[PDB]
Design a binder for this molecule. Sequence first.
Ligand code: NA
Ligand code: NA
Lengths: 145, 146
Amino acid sequence: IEQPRWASKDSAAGAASTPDEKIVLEFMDALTSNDAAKLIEYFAEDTMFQAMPLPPAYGRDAVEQTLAGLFTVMSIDAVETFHIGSSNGLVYTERVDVLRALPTGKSYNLSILGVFQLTEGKITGWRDYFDLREFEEAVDLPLRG
Amino acid sequence: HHHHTSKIEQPRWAAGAASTPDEKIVLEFMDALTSNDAAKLIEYFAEDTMFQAMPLPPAYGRDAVEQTLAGLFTVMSIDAVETFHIGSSNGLVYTERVDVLRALPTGKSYNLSILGVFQLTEGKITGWRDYFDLREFEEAVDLPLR
Ligand code: NA
Ligand code: NA
């Protein structure tokens, strides 16, 4: 994954600087597993997840099943985190996800800005902001009717 | 928000106050967005800068940024901005926020969920990228933006 033109040249921009940011960076590596059972370990009981163009999932049960539903149709082939920062229990990630659609085989580099809420080392909230139509039309896989 | 026709519901998952000089400048830039004035907003930007509403192509340089913002303000108005979360690290400011956008050709309004990032150098914006879903905005206001 190439560094975008607008990427910060601060050598520490993409590096974790707190234990919370290190956990989020480990979560980004584990995203390539496409394994909701593995990823659910990072989540607290009182938590939520939402790919913002799609309906949110509240509670650990709904988060795992929502992630598992996405992984039946798409694979996260690579995650490249350009920027990671944090303030007040929220961690922010500006990144590219290489998403591959299983039915069509096409892949696409999706620009994503996400936020992670963490208490006691566990994710109590994860929201990824991006444009869904770009990914749908890129890989020929509609996720929103 | 001082825009009584607008209403921003409190999100269930929602901290929003500035804790650094860079966060304060970004928050002041958010209040100035309701001016819908590219000539006034461009004063916050440095010479070497960029802007991109991520579903749309980016603009590099203070000239292209002012022109891109001016073009957007000819078809839409920023009626209100509420920042639920603001944070910063490595000279980058992140803002989780809803913007009430009103499309001028149709008169329809929409509350757009946005996560944005601001890179600041000596108090001036060197980068502003807002992440959001364009389609849901387009369909709610009947205004294709691509
Ligand atoms: Na960093
Ligand atoms: Na911080």
